[PDB]
Amino acid sequence: PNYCFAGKTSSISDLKEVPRKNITLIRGLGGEVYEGQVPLQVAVKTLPEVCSEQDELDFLMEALIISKFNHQNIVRCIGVSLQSLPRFILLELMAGGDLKSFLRETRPRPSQPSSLAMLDLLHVARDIACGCQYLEENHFIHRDIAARNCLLTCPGPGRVAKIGDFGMARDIGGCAMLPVKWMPPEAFMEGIFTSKTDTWSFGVLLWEIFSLGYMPYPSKSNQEVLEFVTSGGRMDPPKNCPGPVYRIMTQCWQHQPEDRPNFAIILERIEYCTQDPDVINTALPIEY
Ligand SMILES: C[C@H]1Oc2cc(cnc2N)-c2c(C3CC3)nn(C)c2CN(C)C(=O)c2ccc(F)cc21
Numbered sequence: 001p002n003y004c005f006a007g008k009t010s011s012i013s014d015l016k017e018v019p020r021k022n023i024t025l026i027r028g029l030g031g032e033v034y035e036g037q038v039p040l041q042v043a044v045k046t047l048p049e050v051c052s053e054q055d056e057l058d059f060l061m062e063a064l065i066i067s068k069f070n071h072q073n074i075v076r077c078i079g080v081s082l083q084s085l086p087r088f089i090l091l092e093l094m095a096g097g098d099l100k101s102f103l104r105e106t107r108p109r110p111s112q113p114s115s116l117a118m119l120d121l122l123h124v125a126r127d128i129a130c131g132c133q134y135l136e137e138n139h140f141i142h143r144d145i146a147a148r149n150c151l152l153t154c155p156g157p158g159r160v161a162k163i164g165d166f167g168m169a170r171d172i173g174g175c176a177m178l179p180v181k182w183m184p185p186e187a188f189m190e191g192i193f194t195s196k197t198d199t200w201s202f203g204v205l206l207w208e209i210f211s212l213g214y215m216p217y218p219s220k221s222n223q224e225v226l227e228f229v230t231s232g233g234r235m236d237p238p239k240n241c242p243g244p245v246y247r248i249m250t251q252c253w254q255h256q257p258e259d260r261p262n263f264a265i266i267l268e269r270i271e272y273c274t275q276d277p278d279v280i281n282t283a284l285p286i287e288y
Contacts, residue, residue: 096151142169143187
């Protein structure tokens with residue numbers, strides 16, 4: 001199978017095959033994902049040896065997708081190991097892990113009262129919006145911009161957030177498998193996807209970030225979300241969320257895709273929130 005990006009067509013022959021003998025698995029991280037070494041530290045995405053032909057093409061497509069991107073806020077691909085079984089996709093090891101687990105585990109707590117501040121959250125949001133802007137200007141529609149699909153370079157203050165998973169854009173599973181909680185009305189009703197699909201999803205990711213890793217639409221099922229969103233329903237601000245941050249979310253959630261901001265506008269608004277002392281001086285809630 002072939003793949004086209006930035007006006008250039010590529011094939012499996014363009015993937016950087018890393019000799020299997022050079023790869024060593026260290027631990028399971030959560031097909032399985034392992035921490036590995038090539039010394040270069042890597043996250044090893046594996047293809048189960050017992051899989052369908054569609055699973056193989058999906059895996060090969062994902063390798064092509066990630067290898068052709070070149071941006072600071074998109075996970076790097078070191079190479080692949082497709083000439084040995086199980087097949088491997090070699091990614092940049094992101095020591096901070098996924099954004100969802102990070103937010104949940106690093107929540108300000110009585111023991112860690114200042115573990116995260118509004119500025120840490122704004123920096124993550126900017127980093128992903130910068131990755132989204134690169135995808136938008138390269139006419140790539142992600143389809144699942146969500147905390148679970150983002151990674152961090154380290155747990156510390158100099159962390160860099162990156163988009164780490166491209167399984168959804170690759171697929172294009174059933175109804176209860178569509179990430180309807182991250183989807184705008186024209187995507188779940190008409191199956192229409194544009195650059196404005198990622199804007200809506202980004203607003204939901206912003207809610208995930210500022211809620212510190214909660215599941216969107218608390219207590220609502222997929223069908224309830226579908227009906228809620230269709231009827232003009234929107235999420236409330238996460239706890240202690242400054243008004244200017246929530247305003248970015250509600251602009252991302254405009255019913256008409258044309259009324260939703262592009263990522264250059266999102267980045268300008270995130271930048272303004274970081275400069276605003278009334279935003280960054282707001283204390284995050286302390287979980288008991
Ligand atoms: C495929 C996988 O990639 C990585 C996974 C990790 C780090 N870095 C890369 N590149 C990683 C680590 C290591 C620091 C220990 N801990 N956790 C919790 C994860 C996440 N995870 C198990 C994944 O399956 C995952 C999730 C989202 C994603 F977007 C890509 C990946």
